[PDB]
Amino acid sequence: SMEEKLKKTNIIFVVGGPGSGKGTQCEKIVQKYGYTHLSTGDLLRSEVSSGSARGKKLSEIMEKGQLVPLETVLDMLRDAMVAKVNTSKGFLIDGYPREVQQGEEFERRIGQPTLLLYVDAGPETMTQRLLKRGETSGRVDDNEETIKKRLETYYKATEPVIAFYEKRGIVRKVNAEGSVDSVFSQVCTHLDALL
Amino acid sequence: SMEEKLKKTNIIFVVGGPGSGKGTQCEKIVQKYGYTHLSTGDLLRSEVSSGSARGKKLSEIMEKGQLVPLETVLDMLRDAMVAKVNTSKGFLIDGYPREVQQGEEFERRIGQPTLLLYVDAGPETMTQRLLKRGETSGRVDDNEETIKKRLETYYKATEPVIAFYEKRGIVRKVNAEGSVDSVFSQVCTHLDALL
Ligand SMILES: Nc1ncnc2c1ncn2[C@@H]1O[C@H](COP(=O)(O)OP(=O)(O)OP(=O)(O)OP(=O)(O)OP(=O)(O)OC[C@H]2O[C@@H](n3cnc4c(N)ncnc43)[C@H](O)[C@@H]2O)[C@@H](O)[C@H]1O
Ligand SMILES: Nc1ncnc2c1ncn2[C@@H]1O[C@H](COP(=O)(O)OP(=O)(O)OP(=O)(O)OP(=O)(O)OP(=O)(O)OC[C@H]2O[C@@H](n3cnc4c(N)ncnc43)[C@H](O)[C@@H]2O)[C@@H](O)[C@H]1O
Ligand SMILES: [Zn+2]
Ligand SMILES: [Zn+2]
Ligand SMILES: [Zn+2]
Ligand SMILES: [Zn+2]
Ligand SMILES: [Zn+2]
């Protein structure tokens, strides 16, 4: 069954603040280790891109830097994992879970994480990186006021996810400040010790 | 993509009361036409037989003749479709949807049905068939008190699904009383007109 396949595949939660460098690092991991990268923000923006009514309501939530309903995001995430599991070498789950309840529901419908990679950047680092992206990019959640909301939401809801999984011994932290290459070296040190 | 694939495959919804003969007709369709038969009841009973805590809870609900939660049954159902869509000639969905809400979420995450085959029997015929099976079988829900509850749930929640899909012109009724062969001859007339 697809659910049995899901339980025997490695699941890595990638957790960290807005603009910490999660996507950037995931694409490096994908290139080196061959894992399957799923970002809930990407999947959400793909629905927004349809131009649908449902999409507009989701976009209005993301432009306030708030969390979308748990069901909506977990349904999308599970569907996308079931699509790829049969050929996957492992999953990188970027930006899910964002609250403890999101982690509990994931384990109930899919299964427990094998590892949690914690990309730890400071709030001024994060703000500057997203302000710089907002100059060039088309993302509609990189304005200064919405970066503030995204930071608040992360510290309120998501930082507790780290302490939750910390209890099980599966967290591996990396200093996310400094060069893309310096951060990836730390990422590889953690992954190589397990694989 | 998997999403595109699921939107392209033929989906036939098979709807009818408890003991109306859905499974029996579905196997004859598989034998003649080579479709893929998925019974949500079978799926759920497989989970029960695993011995899981989830299975214990599902059994208690099936023993009251009531509907199990949507996300649990739809996870199982969509998973089974994804596992077979690359090779399937078409799907027979037996016993889902059981309420209008179930139909709407299926359409949004999978695709819209091509046909609804309505297996139409009277309550006395249904009750007599299930008591006869109850003599010999191992099913936990074929006792006389639970048969009664399954009927109530069908008339309250499920028979409205029919009126809902009739508005799209896709409903095809068969008189489900009489021999297995008489019923199947009606079924073939409907399927031949489509195929
Ligand atoms: N589970 C969920 N539940 C409910 N709602 C959900 C949800 N998931 C998503 N949502 C909703 O969708 C919204 C968007 O979610 P999401 O898309 O997940 O946003 P985020 O994780 O908060 O932030 P980013 O994707 O912007 O940052 P990142 O950490 O991926 O960094 P990146 O590599 O891009 O890097 C950022 C920039 O920095 C640069 N950079 C990266 N590393 C470095 C470096 N070392 N030095 C200099 N620059 C760097 C990059 O080039 C780039 O320009 C949420 O706010 C919410 O509304
Ligand atoms: N979507 C969902 N959402 C929430 N919960 C869900 C759900 N789906 C399932 N559930 C849960 O799971 C439970 C079980 O659901 P489910 O297994 O789907 O039960 P059902 O559809 O109510 O009833 P049966 O499967 O017993 O009848 P059938 O119509 O397939 O007829 P059959 O061919 O077996 O034949 C019956 C008997 O009569 C015989 N027979 C058949 N045709 C004839 C004939 N023409 N003449 C004489 N005998 C015949 C057969 O040999 C057999 O012995 C539900 O009650 C619910 O709790
Ligand atoms: Zn990202
Ligand atoms: Zn990616
Ligand atoms: Zn749902
Ligand atoms: Zn059946
Ligand atoms: Zn079958």
| Separation between Cα atoms, residue B93 and residue B6, nearest integer Å | 13
Q: Give the technique used to solve this structure.
A: X-ray
A71 and B71 within 8 Å at the Cβ level: the answer is yes
Instruction: Give the residue from A6, A46, A82, A109 with the most B CB atoms within 10 Å of its CB, the best one to mutate.
Output: A82
Contact A73, A81 (CB under 8 A): no
Backbone angles phi, psi at B160, to 5 degrees: -55, -25
Does ligand 2 lie within 6 Å of residue B129's CB atom?
A: yes
Resolution in angstroms, to 1 decimal, for this deposition? 1.9
CA nearest to B82 within chain A: A83
- A145-159: string of b/e by CB count within 10 Å (b at 16+)? ebbebbbebbeebbe
Residue ranges at the known binding site of A: 19-24, 40, 45, 66-68, 95-98, 102, 133, 139, 150, 178
Does ligand 2 lie within 6 Å of residue B73's CB atom?
A: yes
> Environment class of residue B120 by beta-carbon count within 10 Å: exposed (0-12), middle (13-18) or buried (19+)?
middle
Nearest Cα residue to atom 27 of ligand 2: B19
**DSSP, residue by residue, B57-109:** HHHHHHTTT-PPPHHHHHHHHHHHHHHHTTT-S-EEEES--SSHHHHHHHHHH
State which of B14, B22, B76, B155 you would mutate to test the pocket of ligand 2, scoring each by most atoms of that ligand within 8 A of its C-beta. Answer: B22
DSSP A163: H
At B99, which CATH number?
3.40.50.300
| Separation between Cα atoms, residue A121 and residue A77, nearest integer Å | 25
Does ligand 2 lie within 6 Å of residue B140's CB atom?
A: no
DSSP A85: G
Q: How far is the CA of B25 from the centre of ligand 6 (A)?
A: 10
Q: In ligand 1, which atom is closest to the CA atom of A94? A: 18
Q: In ligand 1, which atom is closest to the CA atom of A16? A: 29
B83 and A3 within 8 Å at the Cβ level: the answer is no
The total domain count for chain B is: 1
| Separation between Cα atoms, residue A5 and residue A85, nearest integer Å | 7
Domain span at residue B63 reads 1-195
- B83-95: string of b/e by CB count within 10 Å (b at 16+)? bebeebebbbbbb
B39 has which bridge partners? B94
Q: Which long-range contacts (CB under 8 A, 24 or more apart) does A56-63 make?
A: A59/A140, A62/A140, A62/A141, A63/A140, A63/A141, A63/A146
- Residues in Cβ contact with B170 at an 8 Å cutoff, skipping those fewer than 6 apart: B113, B114, B115, B116
CA nearest to B43 within chain A: A1
Q: What angle do CA A16, A19, A20 make, to 5 degrees?
A: 40
Contact A100, A161 (CB under 8 A): yes
Residue ranges at the known binding site of A for ATP: 19-24, 133, 178
Residue among B82, B61, B63, B64 at smallest CA distance from B72: B61
State which of A13, A22, A29 you would mutate to test the pocket of ligand 1, scoring each by most atoms of that ligand within 8 A of its C-beta. Answer: A22
